[PDB]
Amino acid sequence: MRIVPFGAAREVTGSAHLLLAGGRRVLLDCGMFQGKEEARNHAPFGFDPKEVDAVLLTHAHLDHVGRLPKLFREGYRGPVYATRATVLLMEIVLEDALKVMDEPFFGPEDVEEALGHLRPLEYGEWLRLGALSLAFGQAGHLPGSAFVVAQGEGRTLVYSGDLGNREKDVLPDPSLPPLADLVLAEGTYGDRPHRPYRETVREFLEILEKTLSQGGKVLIPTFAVERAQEILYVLYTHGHRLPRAPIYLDSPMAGRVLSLYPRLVRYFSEEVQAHFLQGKNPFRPAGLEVVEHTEASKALNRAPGPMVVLAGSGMLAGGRILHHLKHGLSDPRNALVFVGYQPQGGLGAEIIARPPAVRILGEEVPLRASVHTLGGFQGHAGQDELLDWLQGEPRVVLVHGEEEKLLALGKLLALRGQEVSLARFGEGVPV
Ligand SMILES: [Zn+2]
Ligand SMILES: [Zn+2]
């Protein structure tokens, strides 16, 4: 039994791992590369998409399912297993990536074909391929997110997929992995533990009351798949003490994803499921409004506060958010609230460096609005959480993370008596 890293090696995008065991070929995730690696979605997989017997998807994020339609474009016709939640989100994620893509490396025919082979596989349901047994464990990272347990040939392998930040309230805690002979694990934040959740929420509420009370705007860059709805959830459960103000989810996609949540009630934490039981959707704070088109979106720029605005892209690469930033950053009464990791050298970091001005949409804009970074809303397990999850596991191969971050984590694993390496592209490892 061998596992061959075919992406996310010494990097964060491109998650795709081929499992060779029991005389079968099972692909674990099939994400696209993103950002600077984006061009590599055009390059070949490094394996034959026709010899694959079946593929398992840990979750709907584009960096785990984005190359799936390419797998089908190039021949594959096997089954694609994923939890109902991932299956349903996957549709919104792929359609969108298609419509919003410069150099598309697949077409509508491939998305359709790909979605056509999705088969529901919930947690604790065993899959049988040859003499190989595979099951999903709770990863608590996205509704329907899971880690993979592959047992066969007398051995056990565990692919973590992306592990969640167990401190937040929306998703159920990540389950412990079973004792395994080999663990393929992410290490996005292998270099440090994250800021505590409760304290980030309090701080968040402090920021809201202050700027909303003075008639200012609270601008929030958010990814549309799950971070946006988590913010609305915090806004919903604390709406009793926040000043009245319209909440604009200025993101069609975030909207489509949100409309889907009521159907995924069983995929949330007990806290969230208990709210739905009371008969009320905890992801729709009072005053919520999903903005569908550009005209109303831009009208928000010249309208006065108080208001809360959630918009993408989550890392200021593009999206309506730039238009809000452009027109709101120069007003001292407004506040910018980052609820996620800002890439090095990006407009995010540049703003945090707090210069006298910033360049947004071909224009220099005075930066007077207050700026706040709430690291606590982070969606991946931090270093300390990675350690606990990995406790007692004999061997560990690291993927999904920048080199230095995988190393810092590697160090601690090593000093703990655990054997570890940094998965290399194309180089398989013995389970
Ligand atoms: Zn993810
Ligand atoms: Zn990922």
- DSSP secondary structure letters along 118-157: EEE--TT--EEETTEEEEEEE--SSTT-EEEEEEETTEEE
- Note the CATH number of domain 196-377: 3.40.50.10890
Q: In angstroms, rounded to a whole number, what is the distance separating the alpha carbons of residues 414 and 158?
A: 19
User: Exposed, middle or buried by CB within 10 Å (0-12, 13-18, 19+), for 313?
Assistant: middle
Cα angle, residue 195 at apex, residues 29 and 165 outer, rounded to 5°:
30
Contacts of 22 (CB under 8 A, 6+ apart): 1, 129, 130, 131, 132, 152, 153
- Contacts of residue 296, defined as CB under 8 A and 6 or more positions apart, other chains included, come to none
Instruction: Report d(CA 43, CA 98) in Å as an integer.
Output: 18
The per-residue DSSP string of 182-244 comes to EEEEE-TTTT-PPPPHHHHHHHHHHHHHHHHHTT-EEEEE--TTTHHHHHHHHHHHSGGGSPP
- Count each helix (H run) and each strand (E run) in the chain, helices first: 13, 22
Q: State the structure-solving technique.
A: X-ray
* 309 within 8 A of 217, measured Cβ to Cβ: yes
Q: How far apart are the first and last CA of the chain?
A: 5
8-state DSSP, 17: E
Whether residue 218 contacts residue 268, with contact meaning beta carbons closer than 8 Å, is answered with no
Q: Known binder of ligand: residue 275? A: no
Question: Cα(66) to centroid of ligand 2, in Å?
Answer: 11
CA-wise closest residue to 32 among 85, 132, 111, 146? 111
Domain ranges of the chain: 1-195+378-431, 196-377
Query: What is the enclosing helix (H) or strand (E) of 290?
Result: strand 288-290
Return d(Cα 80, Cα 67) in angstroms, integer: 13
Q: Is 400 annotated as a binding residue?
A: yes
Q: Is residue 144 within 8 Å of residue 85, measured between CB atoms?
A: yes
Please check whether residue 222 is in contact with residue 251, taking contact to mean a CB–CB distance below 8 angstroms: yes
CA of 405 to the centre of ligand 1 (A): 17
Distance CA 218, CA 328 (A): 9
Would you say 323 is a known binding-site residue?
no
> Minimum-distance ligand to the CA of 140?
1
Rounded distance between C-alpha atoms, residue 28 and residue 399, angstroms: 13
Distance from C-alpha of 86 to C-alpha of 93, rounded to nearest angstrom = 10
Alpha-carbon distance of 10 to 405, in angstroms, equals 9
Residues 6+ apart with CB under 8 A from 303: none
Q: Entry resolution in angstroms?
A: 2.5
Question: 344 CA distance to ligand 1 centroid (A)?
Answer: 19
- The separation between CA 240 and the C-alpha centre of its own chain, rounded to angstroms, equals 29
3-state secondary structure of 335: strand
Q: Tell me the CA–centroid distance for residue 89 and ligand 1, in Å.
A: 12
Is 363 exposed, middle or buried (CB count within 10 Å of its CB: 0-12, 13-18, 19+)? Answer: exposed
Question: In angstroms, what is the span from residue 361 Cα to ligand 1's centroid?
Answer: 29
Q: Which residue is listed with tokens 């969108």?
A: 96
CA distance 55 to 17: 10
**Distance in Å, CA 206 to ligand 2 centroid:** 31
Distance 178 CA to ligand 1 centre (A): 21
Backbone angles phi, psi at 134, to 5 degrees: -130, 135
Using the mean position of ligand 1's atoms as its centre, give its distance from the Cα of residue 67 in Å.
14
Length of the chain: 431
CA of 188, nearest ligand number: 2
Q: Enter the tokens of residue 48.
A: 């034959």
- In angstroms, the Cα distances linking 404 to 10, 11, 128, 187, 271 are 9, 10, 38, 10, 36
- Ligand 1 center from residue 371 Cα (angstroms): 26
372 a known binding residue? no
Ligand nearest to the CA of 60: 1
CA 413/CA 406 separation, integer angstroms: 10
For the chain, percent helix, then strand, then coil, each to nearest 5? Answer: 35, 20, 45
Backbone angles phi, psi at 420, to 5 degrees: -150, 150
Distance 391 CA to ligand 1 centre (A): 22
Residue 138 CA to residue 122 CA, distance in Å, equals 10
Q: Coil, strand or helix: which one is 197?
A: helix
Cβ atoms of 17 and 429 within 8 Å: the answer is: no
Breaks in the chain (C–N > 2.5 Å) following residue? none
Calculate how far, in angstroms, residue 352's C-alpha sits from the geometric centre of ligand 2. 25
Please, where are the H alpha helices in 238-352? Answer: 252-260, 270-277, 294-302, 321-328, 347-352
Tell me the three state secondary structure of residue 338: strand
Tokens of 21: 């065991």
Label the pairing between strands 2-5 and 429-430: antiparallel
Spacing of C-alpha 106 from chain mean position: 22
State the pairing for strand pair 2-5/17-21. antiparallel
Integer Cα distance of 135 and 122 in angstroms? 8
Distance between Cα 14 and ligand 2 center (Å): 8
Phi-psi region of 101 (alpha: psi -120 to 50; beta: other; left: phi over 0): beta
Cis, peptide link before residue 421, omega less than 30° from 0? no
Q: How open is the CA angle 74-78-79, to the nearest 5 degrees?
A: 130
**Ligand having the closest approach to the CA of 63:** 2
Phi and psi at residue 19, to the nearest 5°:
-100, 120
Domain 1-195+378-431 of CATH type 3.60.15.10: yes
Q: Does 191 belong to an annotated binding site? A: no
Residue 162 annotated as binding site: yes
CB contact at 8 A, 114 and 71? yes
Nearest bound ligand to the CA of residue 7? 2
| 334 in Cβ contact with 300 (< 8 Å) | no
Q: For residues 353 and 332, what is the distance between their CA atoms, to the nearest angstrom? A: 17
Contact, 126 vs 133, CB < 8 A?
yes
Neighbours of 343 (CB within 10 A): 12
367, 355 contact by CB (below 8 A): yes
Interval between CA 63 and ligand 2 midpoint (Å): 5
Residue with token string 């593009």: 318
Q: Whose atoms come closest to the Cα of 141: which ligand?
A: 1
Token duo for residue 411:
């160090």
